[PDB]
């Protein structure tokens, strides 16, 4: 059950200790490197193009509506515990990307195939058993969080606000999905490179617009979050179920800390060493949770700090849009627009995430089948009725989660050694 979350975060504590809080110091340099200009040394696409691919998958309706679900059910304190998920999770994502170096490229052009299923093959053979299990899960798990959750949330949200959107929204999402992923990952890096920054800058500025117009409410909004999350007034650590569990569960969803579904994109980077790309990847969480999600969480609390009628019982995606429209003139239109790109981003990335784990099982023979399935399932997800889709998604992600976490624990020695190589290269 949810013991895996105690396991998942436990690695985050563990690796951060073993890696001595590496994330706080390396973060600026990795940020400089990730967005640095001008490198071509054995890779499918740029470091930047890999990050935008990973961020496209990492940024999803969980950033828009998954936080809202956590804010209502777990209280505003869930945001802080979402942060702890990312901060300690930074090390987890890094360890994922480092170990992705034990990757062998596939046939049908370079394409290259790196991921946790490969680590397990290069573990201490059981790893063959774990890797085939991981691919078995991840190949399925991609449809939930990567396809069905994101494709349904937009479809319903668009139908509420604009209402000329039965299957029509499903159709255009399928066409635009097929066009990009037709040309494989090389095509994906093109689209995710342009889409993601335009998406993120669009959303984040509006939040800073909201904060600018209501400056005074900022610090108390921080206060209620910090006052919550550490509110033991009720129950002996009974906020574990309230704020911590919802903060972690939803937080892991948005930033995808240790699900092992991150470095799959990191492998395609043109990297000299694992450490080069693994630092740019570790920035995936920071942009998702600390930047995007925190932007989303701040607006939600501010509306709660205000009075505002009728938002008291709003489900999730509608809550943030209503919370935005409350504070900003066209906030509702902004959020629903972002939701379209936010989900579309996650469809493409998670397609590659699911592909490569699928091909591990079947080879490149069925890659065409996976792509066409993903496009078809994307169409169905908008039309079909998936009320509790998040719940089954979290199970698949947890099913995906169990093996990779074991690997990161066992292969902690490899990465820490492999790190002591790259950081030595960083003095020259």
């Amino acid at each position, epitope marked *: 059950g949810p013991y895996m979350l105690v396991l998942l975060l436990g690695t985050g504590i563990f690796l951060t200790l073993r890696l001595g809080f590496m994330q706080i110091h390396t973060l600026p340099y990795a940020l400089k490197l990730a967005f640095s200009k001008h490198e071509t040394s054995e890779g499918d696409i740029s470091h930047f193009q890999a990050l935008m691919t990973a961020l496209a998958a990492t940024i999803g309706t969980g950033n828009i509506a998954g936080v809202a679900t956590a804010y209502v059910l777990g209280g505003p304190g869930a945001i802080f515990w979402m942060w702890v998920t990312a901060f300690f999770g930074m090390a987890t994502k890094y360890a994922e990307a480092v170990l992705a170096i034990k990757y062998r490229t596939v046939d049908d052009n370079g394409e290259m195939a790196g991921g946790p299923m490969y680590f397990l093959e290069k573990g201490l053979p059981l790893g063959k058993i774990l890797g085939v299990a991981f691919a078995f899960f991840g190949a399925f798990a991609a449809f939930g969080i990567g396809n069905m959750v994101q494709t*349904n949330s937009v479809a319903d949200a668009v139908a509420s606000n604009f209402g000329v959107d039965p299957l029509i929204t499903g159709f255009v999402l399928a066409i635009f999905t097929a066009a990009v992923i037709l040309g494989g990952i090389k095509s994906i890096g093109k689209a995710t490179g342009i889409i993601v920054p335009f998406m993120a800058v669009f959303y984040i500025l509006a939040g800073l617009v909201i904060l600018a117009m209501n400056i005074g409410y900022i610090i108390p909004a921080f206060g209620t979050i910090f006052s919550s999350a550490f509110n033991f007034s009720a129950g002996f650590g009974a906020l574990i179920g309230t704020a911590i569990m919802w903060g972690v569960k939803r937080g892991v969803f948005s930033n995808e800390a240790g699900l092992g579904s991150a470095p799959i994109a990191a492998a395609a980077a043109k990297t000299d060493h694992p450490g080069r790309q693994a630092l740019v990847s570790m920035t995936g969480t920071f942009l998702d949770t600390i930047v995007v999600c925190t932007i989303t969480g701040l607006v939600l609390t501010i509306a709660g700090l205000k009075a505002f009628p009728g938002l008291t*019982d709003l489900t999730g995606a509608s809550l943030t849009a209503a919370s935005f429209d409350a504070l900003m003139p066209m906030g509702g239109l902004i959020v629903t627009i972002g939701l379209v790109f936010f989900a579309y981003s996650t469809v493409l990335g998670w397609s590659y995430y699911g592909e490569k784990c699928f091909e591990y099982l079947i080879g490149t023979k069925g890659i065409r089948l996976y792509r066409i399935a993903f496009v078809l399932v994307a169409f169905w997800g908008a039309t079909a009725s998936l*009320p509790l889709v998040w719940n089954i998604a979290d199970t698949l992600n947890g099913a995906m989660a169990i093996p990779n976490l074991i690997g990161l624990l066992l292969l902690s020695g490899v990465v820490v050694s492999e790190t002591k190589a790259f950081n030595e290269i960083r003095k020259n």
Partner: antibody
Amino acid sequence: EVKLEESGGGLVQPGGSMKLSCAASGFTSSDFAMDWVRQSPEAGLEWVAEIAASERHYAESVKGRFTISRDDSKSSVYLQMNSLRAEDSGLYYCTRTAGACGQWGTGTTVTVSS
Amino acid sequence: DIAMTQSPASLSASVGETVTITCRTSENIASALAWYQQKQGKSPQLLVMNAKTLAAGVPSRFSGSGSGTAFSLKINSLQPEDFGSYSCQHAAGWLLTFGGGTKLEIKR
């Protein structure tokens, strides 16, 4: 303030069909997910159906015999019941859902008997 | 299915005293428990949301507490206007269930 008025209740023979209505006003039917809750003549209070604007969920007791629909243009929610049973007798209440059922309807009465 | 059992099934309270009502359920549900009050010819009225949080416009005498596997609804200094049936509901999932109900009556 907020308005929820149910309608369409009546007397229907077992195996029959009818659809209820819940004209809503005072807020945005489109943004909120809506529920149908029914109370038996013995104060049962049983949940029936869920809907948001696209997808729906049903209780196992009625799965396949109830159809919940919505019309955000006409700001009304529907519940279509067919192949009715005697146990379907109760007061059918309209309401909007999230975690607690705060804003409730008037209630309309269904009697299934020969 | 989650089964929530309420006790006592019915009680009579001498006016002006304090009473405590219990809703107990099969499995742990965190803080996702809500309380209502229903009167003759009326829909249920929300009293306490999410175990302890307080609804607006409902008098302060009503208080609810508990988490997990023990819930209690507490009324301080009852009044004859509190005569009715008190029901509990949980938000575990989307098929929210309800209790059998507790009938509150008045002593004279």
